[PDB]
Structure 1
């Protein structure tokens, strides 16, 4: 093995890729590889939803966008530009990059970001947001992985939405859907199903986050 830290990540945003979206919420959940392994091999039909590991670093932040959320985006996320602004939320700026860098620096390296549909949404969007900044990217030196690819490779060894996978494994609806922390915790639970095989796959397929093409711009 080699990845020492897995950082489960989700974003909420103003809309879909075609609308050229801006991030409205992000959550990072850093778990050491040993904490993942030390979840039991899921047993029972269905297995109970596992508790997160005790030792965990968490960062969840709301972010004011420069453009308004779409009707459908505000509906599912429960966030709006006006509500983010009135509650004094700041934009995706240099101070946020320092925050992210300092958080990431507290983790043993190498680090791998894990996001559901990360390759098509979360990673390219995050790359676009960071490229606007004047500070060096805080995610330089870090690696990344799409959990959908992970689950597909583990499963094969129809819907692949986060909710559908979770309900298939646990026979329960996920909670706090379409919130950054809620979806991160849901993703964690899914990745605790076969953590030893997951980490093995992650070490095999982790790519530099610097190779991720920006969504736009």
Structure 2
């Protein structure tokens, strides 16, 4: 193997891809290769939801968008533009790129971002947000993978919503759905089910983030 760090990633946004959305919240949870492994393969029917590894770097940030959240977007995320602005949240800017860079630089390399439906939503959107900045992309040099593709490959070797996958493994609803941190913790739990097979698949399929096409722009 060779990916040293998996960075679990989720985003909330102002709306669907067709509306040309902006990020309103993002979470990164960096776990070393070995901390993932040294969960068990979780035994029980159903198994208990595992505790995260002890050693973890986490970053969760709310981001003011330049356009308004759609009606449904505010209901499920519990974020709004007005509420983000009134609490002094800054836009997706150069300073956020430096924070992101400095955080990534603390992780052993190579690093692979891992996101649920990442190839269709999170990565394309993140690529668009960063392409607005004057600074070089902090995710240049990092890899990425979609956890849905991972889980279809591991499983097969009907709904694939994060919630549905989680409740099938654990027999409990996930908590804090559609919060970036909540959803990252939920995905981490799902990825602790067979972490050794996961890592093997990720080492096979990780692709440069630089080859992610932007959602729009």
1:17-58 Cα shifts (integer Å, max 9, x gaps):
000000000000000000000000110000000000000000
Match of 1:99 in 2: 99
The 1-side partners of 2:110 and 2:182 are apart by: 25
CA distance in 1, matches of 2:209, 2:154: 22
Extract structure 1 runs of 4+ deviating beyond 2 A: none
Residues 43-101 of structure 1 deviation map (CA, whole Å, 9 limit, x = unaligned): 00000000000000000000000000000000000000000000000000000000000
Q: How many residues align?
A: 217
TM-score, length basis structure 2: 1.00
Q: Structure 2: any 5+ residue segments left out of the alignment?
A: none
Query: How far apart are residue 14 of structure 1 and its match?
Result: 0.1
Q: What's the CA shift for 1:118?
A: 0.1
CA displacement at 1:122 relative to structure 2: 0.1
For the residues of structure 2 that align with 1:7 and 1:139, how far apart are their CA atoms?
11
Q: RMSD value over aligned CA atoms?
A: 0.2
Structure 1 residue runs without a partner (length 5+):
none
For 1:129 and 1:34, locate their aligned partners in 2 and report how far apart those are by CA, in whole Å: 32
Deviation of 1:145 after TM superposition, in Å, equals 0.1
CA distances 1:161-196 after superposition (whole Å, capped 9, x unpaired): 000000000000000000000000000000000000
Please report the TM-score for the alignment, with normalisation by the length of structure 1. Answer: 1.00
